[PDB]
Design a protein around this ligand. Structure first.
Ligand SMILES: *C(=O)[C@H](C[C@@H]1CCNC1=O)NC(=O)[C@H](CC1CCCCC1)NC(=O)c1cc2ccccc2[nH]1
Ligand SMILES: *C(=O)[C@H](C[C@@H]1CCNC1=O)NC(=O)[C@H](CC1CCCCC1)NC(=O)c1cc2ccccc2[nH]1
Lengths: 298, 298
């Protein structure tokens, strides 16, 4: 019993609306009296190739934004641009607005995605900010505006809004202040991400998750130094391990009875010799989208 | 970009309550003026070994049942037993009751679980009813009463309520009629699931999914027949394929140009050679909890 778990999405579902400009429809996030959505909703198919969003936005009126909260249409009474987001002010304040915050997540961190289509939520899943600032989502046509988020107590931390799919099929988007994660831009032009790496801190947390659930076959008696581990990390495209990373793994190290560098020796062996057809926590690949916090939560 | 997604949990979240009998706490489902919960909440540590539930129930006052919807205490007006659930009538009908149906899911179908503890939802994940009528869930102490469900438009089809974990780590529970899935009983005795078979329909879907999202390396220029396949499938403890199942695969076959029976001949291939390292779509063991109705719906 260990698997990717998403946060319950009820507090986010109530915030999802539909936003339409001409023949373009996508999802918006409705908090108090503001609707956030990707600004490229104002793009026609031709403007997408190289838009000037300031020009495009100045030529629109509040009336050109159709905002639907289910059956109720909301009237846009104002609007502005923040980076790659639109902020549409509406006459109604969302009564389902939860306690929330806008946060910018760091690479390797996880969040829940509420995938949405025409303003109605359709699925919820967990994923991670990749070290190269993409996310490996499952976004289809019409999912722009879907948000990523974490829940702490009763507060929703919004961290991602979806904008686009790169040619490799991974995804790119912004935080809720509209700044893109990574080097990308909202222009329909082929864009590459940097070469990705494996989130070592997450792999190790998942190795602890396995031990906690009785999967010990990969352990061994050996240990290793930080510097000696990093040398193998570099060879196999893993993020180097920091002393703060080791400090993060403290609680897991203590509950299991396995020193962090002992788990690193075990991981070094898995990288060098593979896994010999065996599985860890049901997986045959070293999973790197579970954070240490994720592990202790479950 | 191929992953398990759960349905958005909001409509179920607003139905979760906490139910306490003396020193045993678990979750309940609050629809209108009924709360549903497993009947084993009325066991004490000494009763779990061989409970006489009609005996234990008659000895319970309505006041013995501490039901709480968040901050509010709900007052139990009456109670009856339906199979292995209690139906607690309460004074107030829950205003967040959605449109809902009670359904009995079949082996191989999937549903989302809302893992709950103390009446408060903690996480949502996807899983499948195994052919041996267990589920491979992630349930901790206090999870009983959590529900599994699917959502059709705006209607919540509840299909599972959690009761117990078997010695092998898998999980057993009931439909919302209180009829257990499988031959399990709510007594803390030595029960075991029968040998679990592989959901062939879903392995075939995953093989198609490989072809759809790029991964095409395993097919062959050969083709089998339905009985010849089902015969091999049984020797390896794979479910035989049904008449209905070949039809369910229709859309995947057409979109891929690989006849169902050709993929069946591939499966008897990938069956007897091993993936020699090369992963399918993210894993190099065969995934059987991904439906055709997931491969297409993604
Ligand atoms: C918004 O709903 C979609 C989400 C895409 C759709 C498919 N999978 C996704 O993640 N967003 C888009 O289609 C954009 C279009 C651009 C508008 C102008 C500014 C930049 C984004 N994103 C794309 O990534 C896209 C569409 C597209 C069509 C044909 C060839 C390549 C291509 N890339
Ligand atoms: C309710 O919350 C729990 C859910 C369990 C807890 C751990 N993981 C789960 O899914 N339900 C139980 O604990 C049951 C108690 C009822 C069983 C039916 C009749 C009496 C009450 N107990 C078990 O599920 C259980 C105990 C046990 C002991 C040794 C091996 C396996 C085993 N399973």
């Amino acid at each position: 019993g260990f698997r990717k778990m998403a946060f319950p999405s009820g507090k986010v579902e109530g915030c999802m609306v539909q936003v339409t400009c001409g023949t373009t429809t996508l999802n918006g996030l409705w908090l108090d009296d503001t609707v956030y959505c990707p600004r490229h909703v104002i793009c026609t198919a031709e403007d997408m190739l190289n838009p000037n969003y300031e020009d495009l936005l100045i030529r629109k009126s509040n009336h050109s934004f159709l905002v639907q909260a289910g059956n109720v249409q909301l009237r846009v009474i104002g609007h502005s641009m923040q980076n790659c987001l639109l902020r549409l002010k509406v006459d109604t304040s969302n009564p389902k607005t939860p306690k929330y915050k806008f946060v910018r997540i760091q690479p390797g961190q996880t969040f829940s995605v509420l995938a949405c289509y025409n303003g109605s939520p359709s699925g919820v899943y967990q994923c991670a900010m990749r070290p190269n600032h993409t996310i490996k989502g499952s976004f289809l046509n019409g999912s722009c505006g879907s948000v990523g988020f974490n829940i702490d107590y009763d507060c929703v931390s919004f961290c991602y809004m979806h904008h686009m799919e790169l040619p490799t099929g991974v995804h790119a988007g912004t935080d809720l202040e509209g700044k893109f994660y990574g080097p990308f831009v909202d222009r329909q032009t082929a864009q590459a991400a940097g070469t990705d790496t494996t989130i070592t801190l997450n792999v190790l947390a998942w190795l602890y998750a396995a031990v906690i659930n009785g999967d010990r076959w990969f352990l061994n008696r050996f240990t290793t130094t930080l510097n000696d581990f990093n040398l193998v990390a570099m060879k196999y495209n893993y993020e180097p391990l920091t002393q703060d990373h080791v400090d993060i793994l403290g609680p897991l190290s203590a509950q299991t009875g396995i020193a962090v560098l002992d788990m690193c020796a075990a991981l070094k062996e898995l990288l060098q010799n593979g896994m010999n057809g065996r599985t860890i926590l049901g997986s045959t690949i070293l999973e790197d989208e579970f954070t240490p916090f994720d592990v202790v939560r479950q």
